[PDB]
Structure formats: structure tokens, C-alpha cells
């Protein structure tokens, strides 16, 4: 029983942090194979992030301009080059410890472990969720920019996220390994900022499921709703519209539960009408979206 | 900016990971230098369990009764031995991914990662406190006995939970390392029970200092009390005691945010007394005491490993 937070465990991208300096910025790198990846603002100064030109900034600098660090030993770069918002930096030894992995743009409401290293070395890791407003809601420091997201089903590491910057608000934008941002953030130090943020609507429904997996039925009424009266409900809250695809996702816990899915959006609408009273759901008084179908099918069943 | 449960990273605990079989039963096992830690439970059947004599039952099993799978490669027993609650098995082969390590006994209020297992196959990540009842709200599931809790301090992994069993209420109960139970439970199939927990004070403590850090202000207020006044709404609200040592623990935190632990309490007096009136602090409506006042440093500070 119970049910966490529950990260992946972390050895695998440990393995993979490097440290990268250029001049007087220091950050982290995901060695793989013989490239390591970083974001490519390790190249600016501070004039710079105002408005890079990253072309011109990349084209002064030589190999030897990047240091790179696994450990104690010093990799030595043959190559580098820009895509996107990452630098790629090819060095002269593939990583022996390179996972099995794959590079993977996730949607909002996806759920992905967190490696928060400093220097190469890996800090802590804990579970996030990419935001509906493309954001995450992390927990990073001065020099954790480099650090990367990750699933790992099966043993094949699947990377979606590398930290670049945090927002006004104190939540964090970054990339795909690929450089592309995820939402309308630039690596340029301009009046930007994460929109509005709602709630993921499908998360909150799967996390009620397991929490009538682990035996609590208290929130669970007679009513049912339409699809269409449910959103209408939601969004006054709110929460993200719930498609019929979402309806899909979550038949197998519907299924398991013996609820239907509407039955299940007939009583997240009282819960968001009523609170809780005094009460918890799987030990939380709010109502938890980070966690999503797949991850209550993996917790509750295996 | 930004504060998350946090886990240890797990890597060198990963590649001490196995799965140990006796008969038709199978759990995880810790294998460092050429020794594999399981619980002892391991031995027993059904019917073995209501009443176990470990002893006599031990006695009977032999090194061939135990089959140790690390992931791909088979390990040969060459001898076994108890120590309390934990089964210790030779192995022929040291482990070459044994790290720098020590075995550990936690304080109740003190914190710890949790690497789940099942078939000596690491499967999640997360962190834990011991409750002051002596149980932890983990994620377990069949199989997962043998999954190990532990800190990295440095280089040095600190073992110092292994899983045993869940209790009727969904909560966890294990051992130390050397065998030796966390509160008043048993490896036997009898009646048994959380006592009535309590909440850790000091570590609430820590975390409305983690709030502060993070810019969540607005608990905050121009009062301050005395350990003896606190310290009789603490008991009111079934609140661990606190006392002057914890104080002290709270220093570093109490420089950093520049508000004293006893002006500090005066806020968690009021939010005892009055409730948090709609407001939530760091995304929780909840009063979290499962991070320490050194969790709260080591994350607004970067310490890495
Ligand atoms: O991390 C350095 C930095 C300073 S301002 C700004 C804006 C965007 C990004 Cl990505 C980075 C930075
Ligand atoms: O799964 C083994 C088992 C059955 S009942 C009981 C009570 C305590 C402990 Cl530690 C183990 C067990
Ligand atoms: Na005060």
C-alpha cells in the first residue's frame, strides 16, 4: 500500500553528468556516446543574455575554449556545434557508461524525474510534471542549469527535459535534448513570463482512481455528468479541459475501479464544490495532478 | 527557487541490488563485499510464519537453498548466518560495484531515500522519514521486501532501513541493517499495529524555514513564546516536544532567515491554534514534517554527490 511521489531511479543519467566551463560559466553536461549536451547560454556573459547573437558568440570560440569534466578527468572537445538552444560538443571518448536511451518531446501533463546535479555532480532527485503552461515546478539553484528530465521504461532512458533558466515567479523553463523549448520561452533575458496556469484535469482523475485502488471511497457520489457539463464545471476551477482521448487514457483504471469515467468526473465535481471537509486523499488536502495514468497503473500494480 | 521532496541519487545503491530465492518465496537482497543482506523471513512458508523458530529453521536450510540472481548473473551461496532479523549470505564473488559504506541506525524524525525493488530489480525513488511511532508512510507492494533505505554523505552510502513488512493500516515496518527492528514489531504472523503517531515538530519547524527562503511570508507575525509555553500547545496538538537541542539544530536556519526559533514558533503556535484560513504554504495545506532542518539546508544550499 501507500502511494509517493516516486522518481526513477537516478544511476543511469548519474553516469552521464559532466561538468562544462566556458570562461567564467560553469554548468552541467549530459555526456553520451563521444557529444556532450548543454545549453548553449554557457557560451554568454552577462552583456550577452540581453540579446546573444549565439552565431557570432560560437563562431570566436575554439575547442579548447570548452572545458569538460567526468569526475576527475578532464574530457578533451573536438568539436562543438549549436541546435537550437544546445550546445553539442564532440570529445574525443564516448561515455562507457551510456545508457540505453532515447530523446523524447513530452506534452503537457507528462510526468519525468529530475537529476538536479551542481558541477557535474548529482544532487538529489525528485518527480515533476511538465506544467499546461510549459513550465515545471522545480527545485533548482545558481549552476543547476545542464540538468536533465528523464523516464526510464524498461531499462532505455528516455530524455525530455535539460534546465536552462527560472522564471519571475520561481518556476522553470528548459528544453528538449533536441534545443526546442518547451512553450514561448527564449534563452534571452527579456519581460517573460509563465502563463497562467491550470490544473491537469486527467492527473487529478487518475489520482482519485488510485486512491479508490488503496481502499478510500469517501469522495464517490451517485451522480453522473456529460462530458461537455463536466468541462463546463472545470474550467471555472481552473482546470484543463478533458478531452475524449483523456477519457480513453483512463478506461484501464476505470476498468480496474469498476467506476465509470464520467462517474468519476461527476465526483471530482463536488470535491471542487465541497473541499475535503477535514479530510485527505491518499494523505494530501489538496488534489494532486502530477501523477499521471500510466504512473498509477505503474505504482498501484507493477 | 523551489522546493520538492527530494531523494538521494540512487546509482550506488542500484548496483548492490539482488534477488534472493528460497524455495517458492522471493525477495531483494543487499549485496556488498561478498555478503548478501535479505530479511530472514525469507526461509519461512505460510504456515511457517504464525509461529517461526528461525533458529531450528535455519538449521535446516543449506547454502543450496538459496538461490542469489545478480540481474543477469547467478551467485553461489557458499555459507549463511543470522544476525537478528537479517539473513547474512556468503557469496563467491565480491561485489565490484560495492561502494564506501556504513550500516546506520536512524533517529524517529530523521529522514531517509527509499530505493524500491522487486525481483532484486530497482523500480522508484523516494524519500521517507522514520515516524516517531517507529513505522514509515512508504509505497510498497509484494516483492518489494529486502528494498533498503539510506543517506550519502560524501562518498559514503548510509544503509540504514531494510523493508520486513506492512502493517493493517498501509504503513511500513523494517530493520536496521544488523537486524534490528525499527518500534515494537516482530518477522511473525501475529496481531500487530501502529501506535498513534505524532507529528515532528522540529521538522515542521524547518520546512515553515523553507517557506521563508522561498518567499512565503505571510505566517509570519511580531509574537514570540517560551520552549515551556510552546511546548504545551505542541502536546495539545499531539506535536513531538520540542526541545532546547532542537533549538539549536534550527540555528543555521534561524541565521539565514533571521527569525528566531522561538519567533518561529510563535508562527506554528498560531497556525496550530487558528489554521491556515485558506492559505497554503510551499503548494500544501497540510503542516509537512518529513523534510529536516538539514534537508532544508542541503536543498537551499546545492550540496551534491
Ligand atoms: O542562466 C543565465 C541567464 C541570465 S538571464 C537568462 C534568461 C534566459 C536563460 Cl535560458 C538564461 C539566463
Ligand atoms: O511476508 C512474510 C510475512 C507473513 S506475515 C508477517 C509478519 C511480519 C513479517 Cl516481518 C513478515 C510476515
Ligand atoms: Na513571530
Known amino acids: 500500500s501507500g502511494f509517493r511521489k516516486m522518481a526513477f531511479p537516478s544511476g543511469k543519467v548519474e553516469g552521464c553528468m559532466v561538468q562544462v566551463t566556458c570562461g567564467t560559466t560553469t554548468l552541467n553536461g549530459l555526456w553520451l556516446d563521444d557529444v556532450v549536451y548543454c545549453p548553449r547560454h554557457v557560451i554568454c556573459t552577462s552583456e550577452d543574455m540581453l540579446n546573444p547573437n549565439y552565431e557570432d558568440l560560437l563562431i570566436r570560440k575554439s575547442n579548447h575554449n570548452f572545458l569538460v569534466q567526468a569526475g576527475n578527468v578532464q574530457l578533451r572537445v573536438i568539436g562543438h556545434s549549436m541546435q537550437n538552444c544546445v550546445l553539442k560538443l564532440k570529445v574525443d571518448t564516448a561515455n562507457p557508461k551510456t545508457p540505453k536511451y532515447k530523446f523524447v518531446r513530452i506534452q503537457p501533463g507528462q510526468t519525468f524525474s529530475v537529476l538536479a546535479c551542481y558541477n557535474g555532480s548529482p544532487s538529489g532527485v525528485y518527480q515533476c510534471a511538465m506544467r499546461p503552461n510549459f513550465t515545471i515546478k522545480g527545485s533548482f539553484l545558481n549552476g543547476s542549469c545542464g540538468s536533465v528530465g528523464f523516464n526510464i521504461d524498461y531499462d532505455c532512458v528516455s530524455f525530455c527535459y535539460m534546465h536552462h533558466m527560472e522564471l519571475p515567479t520561481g518556476v522553470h523553463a528548459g528544453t528538449d535534448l533536441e534545443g526546442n523549448f518547451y512553450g514561448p520561452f527564449v534563452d534571452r533575458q527579456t519581460a517573460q513570463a509563465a502563463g497562467t496556469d491550470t490544473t491537469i484535469t486527467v492527473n487529478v482523475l487518475a489520482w482519485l482512481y488510485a486512491a479508490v485502488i488503496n481502499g478510500d471511497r469517501?469522495?464517490?457520489?451517485?451522480?453522473?455528468?456529460?462530458?461537455?457539463?463536466?468541462?463546463?464545471?472545470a474550467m471555472k476551477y481552473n482546470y484543463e479541459p478533458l478531452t475524449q482521448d483523456h477519457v480513453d487514457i483512463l478506461g484501464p483504471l476505470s476498468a480496474q475501479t469498476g467506476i465509470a469515467v464520467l462517474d468519476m468526473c461527476a465526483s471530482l465535481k463536488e470535491?471542487?464544490?465541497?473541499?475535503?471537509?477535514?479530510?485527505?486523499?491518499?494523505?494530501?488536502?489538496l488534489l494532486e495532478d502530477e501523477f499521471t495514468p500510466?504512473?498509477?497503473?505503474?505504482?498501484?500494480?507493477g
Open 294 to 301: 500510466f504512473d498509477v497503473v505503474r505504482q498501484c500494480s
Open 218 to 233: 469517501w469522495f464517490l457520489n451517485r451522480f453522473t455528468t456529460t462530458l461537455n457539463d463536466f468541462n463546463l464545471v
Open 271 to 285: 470535491l471542487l464544490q465541497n473541499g475535503m471537509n477535514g479530510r485527505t486523499i491518499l494523505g494530501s488536502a
